[PDB]
Ligand binder design. Structure first.
Ligand SMILES: NC[C@H](N)c1ccc2c(c1)OCCO2
Ligand SMILES: NC[C@H](N)c1ccc2c(c1)OCCO2
Lengths: 237, 300
């Protein structure tokens, strides 16, 4: 069924599973036209498909040309997402195909179910976790590849860098969701935290800085403080 | 006009004949139903006074044989049987009529409700949904499951309605996923009408039969089928105009006939609100919408 805090360790068992987040597929800016009306301009988006055990991120870049001359784009975006996830599964060797796909938004259930009718043994599930994957475009190297794309493209990343050499998947996912939640809540302050110290850099082949184990503890504490600080500012606490 | 005689009435029972019903007391001198209109299928149905569990009954057409009812004290029910001795049968009916031991089918000369409810229902199609090939009449009861209900348990006692499933490969062309799910015209017109039913008359016959089994027996799987067949049409952008015109007429009669106090259990709020107010055909069901709003405004 649905996925929540009771069965959270299930994410890190040995059954292949993918999260799918569609919140950055259809991205628009709203602006005033010459006649005083409002018009939208689309910008490139992406599907965020993540294996939470391994960190493998299948980032399908959605180029604005896919919306040309289409209507009800917010509805189409869900079906385009389902089409692309189905295509990804079919491209994977059988032993790499997921046993479950967990969608972050329940509006993705029917589109994905219909596209995956040929895979009756892949479970399509919602989750009751509120996951901050919309903030993926706050990761500079992900935002850069999406905005520079001139055509549809799939790019593969490991969103955990090399962390799994030193920590468990459970801990890596918890670190990722804390980082993304902080970037979602206050992007400027989170990036300041991550880059404040010039002697710690991001390797060419990584997304995040090369923190030692002790520095990650400090960083994680500063991210928790940011989230709590912003909660106090929001609710006047 | 034809006659279904009863050997006797040994247990107290409410007897239905089509949309009519009457009570018979234990061992009362009741010997059947005469003046039964030729030209329509009919259903004779039963609910025991001492055990309202199991409504059950028999679909039949008096043009296909001489049928009668006899109580079986071992299986505990009124059974329909066919009498092959025509002269014996006529002699029995004539005697019971002479002694005025039969009730007259209560049709009003102005009243076309049965024809309107069974316009497309034929015995041959009933006998393909209800499989018991040795009888010319068909038994249905409140508990019988449908083939689709048995896929999600005795196959010989099942209602073989046409399976409709909106999230199935039959309903959804590879490569037309969005198109076929948001608009069901392919599934309605190519798969169901052209492919399975052959024409809209057979589709409407099964829809009408499902409704009547839902209403007369409280058969839940029949109610599911009735609503699925409505939703398939309403959720299709492209439907032949004559089908749209006739469906409104068919649905109006079904909503008008339903017992007011059974509406909570025989009508699916989601389906009706979607069909009347959100679907492609939301503006094609004039009279069905008018009677629904005046008779069941709560559901909406
Ligand atoms: N079928 C003709 C027969 N005379 C008839 C007609 C209407 C009736 C009725 C009997 O009994 C009472 C209810 O209304
Ligand atoms: N072209 C007339 C059409 N057959 C029609 C449609 C709806 C109806 C009806 C007749 O009379 C019954 C109530 O609703």
């Amino acid at each position: 069924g649905a996925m929540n805090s009771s069965n959270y360790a299930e994410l890190f068992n040995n059954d292949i599973k993918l999260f799918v987040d569609d919140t950055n597929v259809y991205r628009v800016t709203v602006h005033k036209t010459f006649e005083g009306n409002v018009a939208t301009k689309a910008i490139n988006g992406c599907i965020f498909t993540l294996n939470p055990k391994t960190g493998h991120l299948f980032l399908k870049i959605i180029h604005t040309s896919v919306w040309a001359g289409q209507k009800r784009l917010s509805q189409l975006a869900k079906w385009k997402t389902a089409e692309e996830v189905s295509a990804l599964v079919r491209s994977l060797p059988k032993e790499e195909q997921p046993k479950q796909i967990i969608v972050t938004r329940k509006a993705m259930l029917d589109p994905l179910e219909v596209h995956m009718l040929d895979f009756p043994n892949i479970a399509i599930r919602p989750t009751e976790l509120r996951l901050p994957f919309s903030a993926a475009m706050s990761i500079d190297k992900l935002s850069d590849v999406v905005m520079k794309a001139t055509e549809p493209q799939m790019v593969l990343f490991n969103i955990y860098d090399d962390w799994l050499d030193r920590i468990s998947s459970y801990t890596a996912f918890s670190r990722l969701t804390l980082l993304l939640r902080a970037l979602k809540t206050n992007e400027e302050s989170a990036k300041m935290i991550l880059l404040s110290d010039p002697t710690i850099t991001i390797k060419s082949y990584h997304l995040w800085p090369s923190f030692t184990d002790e520095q990650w503890i400090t960083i994680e504490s500063q991210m928790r403080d940011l989230i709590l600080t912003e909660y106090g500012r929001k609710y006047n606490v | 006009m034809n006659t279904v005689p009863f050997t006797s009435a040994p247990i107290e029972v409410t007897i239905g004949i089509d949309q009519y019903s009457f009570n018979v007391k234990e061992n009362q001198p009741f010997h059947g139903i005469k003046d039964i209109p030729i030209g329509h299928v009919h259903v004779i149905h039963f609910q025991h006074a001492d055990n309202s569990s199991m409504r059950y009954g028999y679909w039949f057409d008096c043009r296909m044989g001489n049928f009668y009812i006899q109580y079986d004290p071992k299986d505990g029910l009124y059974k329909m049987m066919e009498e092959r001795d025509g002269a014996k049968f006529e002699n029995i009916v004539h005697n019971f009529k002479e002694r005025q031991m039969m009730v007259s089918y209560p049709k009003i000369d102005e009243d076309d409700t049965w024809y309107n409810l069974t316009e497309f229902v034929q015995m041959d199609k009933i006998r393909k949904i209800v499989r018991k090939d040795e009888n010319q009449f068909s038994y249905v009861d409140s508990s019988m499951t449908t083939v689709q209900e048995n896929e999600l348990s005795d196959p010989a006692h099942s209602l073989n309605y046409t399976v409709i499933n909106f999230k199935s490969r039959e309903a959804i062309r590879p490569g037309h996923e969005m198109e076929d799910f948001l608009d069901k015209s392919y599934y309605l017109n190519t798969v169901m009408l052209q492919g399975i039913f052959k024409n809209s008359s057979n589709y409407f016959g099964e829809l009408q039969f499902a409704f009547l089994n839902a209403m007369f027996f409280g058969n839940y799987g029949s109610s599911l089928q009735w609503h699925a067949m409505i939703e398939l049409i309403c959720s299709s952008a492209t439907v032949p105009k004559h089908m749209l015109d006739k469906l409104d007429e068919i649905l109006y009669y079904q909503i008008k006939t339903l017992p007011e106090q059974y509406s909570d259990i025989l009508l699916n709020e989601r389906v009706w609100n979607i069909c009347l107010y959100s679907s492609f055909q939301k503006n094609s069901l004039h009279n069905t919408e008018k009677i629904m709003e005046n008779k069941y405004p709560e559901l909406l």
